[PDB]
Design an enzyme around this catalytic site. Sequence first.
Site, PDB file in Angstrom:
ATOM      1  N   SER A  93       0.801  -1.223   0.000  1.00 30.54           N
ATOM      2  CA  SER A  93       0.000   0.000   0.000  1.00 30.54           C
ATOM      3  C   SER A  93       0.833   1.273   0.000  1.00 30.54           C
ATOM      4  CB  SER A  93      -0.963   0.027   1.186  1.00 30.54           C
ATOM      5  OG  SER A  93      -1.809  -1.098   1.174  1.00 30.54           O
ATOM      6  N   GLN A  95       1.843   4.650   1.501  1.00 35.09           N
ATOM      7  CA  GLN A  95       1.790   5.123   2.880  1.00 35.09           C
ATOM      8  C   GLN A  95       2.412   6.492   3.074  1.00 35.09           C
ATOM      9  OE1 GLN A  95       3.354   1.979   5.410  1.00 35.09           O
ATOM     10  NE2 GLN A  95       1.831   0.518   4.665  1.00 35.09           N
ATOM     11  N   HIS A  97       3.944   8.836   6.479  1.00 34.60           N
ATOM     12  CA  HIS A  97       4.291   8.968   7.900  1.00 34.60           C
ATOM     13  C   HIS A  97       4.186  10.439   8.292  1.00 34.60           C
ATOM     14  CE1 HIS A  97       5.634   4.869   8.001  1.00 34.60           C
ATOM     15  NE2 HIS A  97       6.542   5.084   7.068  1.00 34.60           N
ATOM     16  N   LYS A 130      10.278   9.358  13.116  1.00 31.58           N
ATOM     17  CA  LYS A 130      11.654   8.950  12.799  1.00 31.58           C
ATOM     18  C   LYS A 130      11.703   8.464  11.358  1.00 31.58           C
ATOM     19  CE  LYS A 130      11.100   7.950  17.462  1.00 31.58           C
ATOM     20  NZ  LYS A 130      12.217   8.847  17.889  1.00 31.58           N
ATOM     21  N   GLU A 132      12.944   6.380   7.970  1.00 33.53           N
ATOM     22  CA  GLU A 132      13.162   4.970   7.775  1.00 33.53           C
ATOM     23  C   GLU A 132      14.129   4.920   6.623  1.00 33.53           C
ATOM     24  OE1 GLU A 132      10.632   1.396   5.667  1.00 33.53           O
ATOM     25  OE2 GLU A 132       9.760   2.527   7.346  1.00 33.53           O
ATOM     26  N   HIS A 253       4.855   7.075  -0.268  1.00 32.19           N
ATOM     27  CA  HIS A 253       5.808   6.109  -0.800  1.00 32.19           C
ATOM     28  C   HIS A 253       5.167   4.731  -0.799  1.00 32.19           C
ATOM     29  CE1 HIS A 253       6.304   6.323   3.610  1.00 32.19           C
ATOM     30  NE2 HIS A 253       6.449   5.014   3.527  1.00 32.19           N
ATOM     31  N   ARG A 272      -2.761   5.608   5.151  1.00 35.21           N
ATOM     32  CA  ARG A 272      -2.762   4.992   3.829  1.00 35.21           C
ATOM     33  C   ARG A 272      -3.177   5.994   2.776  1.00 35.21           C
ATOM     34  NH1 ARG A 272      -6.311   2.697   5.550  1.00 35.21           N
ATOM     35  NH2 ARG A 272      -5.874   1.543   7.485  1.00 35.21           N
ATOM     36  N   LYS A 278      -8.775  -0.893   2.375  1.00 28.37           N
ATOM     37  CA  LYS A 278      -9.132  -0.211   3.620  1.00 28.37           C
ATOM     38  C   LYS A 278      -9.670   1.218   3.447  1.00 28.37           C
ATOM     39  CE  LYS A 278      -6.063  -2.751   6.679  1.00 28.37           C
ATOM     40  NZ  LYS A 278      -7.348  -3.456   6.933  1.00 28.37           N
TER      41      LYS A 278
END
Length: 389
Positions: A93, A95, A97, A130, A132, A253, A272, A278
């Site tokens: 999916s 996403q 952050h 944070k 990734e 991303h 998402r 969903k």
Amino acid sequence: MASMQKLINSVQNYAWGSKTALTELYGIANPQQQPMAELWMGAHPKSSSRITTVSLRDAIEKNKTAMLGEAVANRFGELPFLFKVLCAAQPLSIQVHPNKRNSEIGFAKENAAGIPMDAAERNYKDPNHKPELVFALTPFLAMNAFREFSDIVSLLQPVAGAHSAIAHFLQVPNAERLSQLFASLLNMQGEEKSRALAVLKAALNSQQGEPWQTIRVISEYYPDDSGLFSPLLLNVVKLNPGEAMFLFAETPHAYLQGVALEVMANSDNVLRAGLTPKYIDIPELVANVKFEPKPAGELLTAPVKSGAELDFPIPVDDFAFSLHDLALQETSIGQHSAAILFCVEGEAVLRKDEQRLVLKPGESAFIGADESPVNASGTGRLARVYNKL
């Protein structure tokens, strides 16, 4: 506990995982041909790695300063990173952050609502952000960040008639109209949606190459998803093995195919943005996306080589990631923190005084702060997650 602890690591058998990759790469047993989606290296409370058997979590809990090092025991109070091998056999999916401030807010909203941390409805598990880092082990297809506006304009041409929002953006390609475009696509319903997708699918037969190819591939898994337009808005990236990217906050991303190492927080926040069956709260999502292009030349993180060490500098205190070229002559690998060492390829021999530990590809060891340094020799490359503080 010996100086160097060979890890027993969890494999998460999520349905999207590859049935073969961990076996092909690392000889990890899979006689039942289960999908193997993620290999976890760390001390996550839901599925900690084990040492020889006891939970690594539990071991750390009993002497945090010795195991984590003073800096990490001070700043974090726990192992501050989760290190994974991700094997995406199906596109995942899209996403986002959220940034620090919005994470504090969402975390609080969910706590105030009494949503259990483990609930499937729970989107915020940390009042912070944070980054990734993702590092390709095999060629790795992903989307990351918005394309330059002129690129989006060129790509939207063949589908200008799919939706009025597309026309609207083309008329004045800017951040505000990109935001409106993104929201409109996600909110398409019923015949509006089916008409837009029909236009796109017709385009897929008269456009060649990327990103049209990526759309074709994704459509096999998400044939009725408004996220099919996303490769026209987001950069499609194909990482060669050994290339990496850092995922910034507020930036869509998606991981689409391949095997990668992932270095991340134990607890994160996910909204998402498509390629999902969903529910998406669109106003919330939009309020947490920065509609600003990121140039292709800035997508990969630039590492720094110093002797045998290739560091991937990460703009965060929590964790650091380096690759170490092994030679038959020992080199010293040292840090002020807990470390996890993972054999990428070749074969690693770790030595601490008279203890020796061999790591074949795919295997890893935990080194407590008190046990630094260790000497490494062999062939191939060793990946290290640790903390630089």
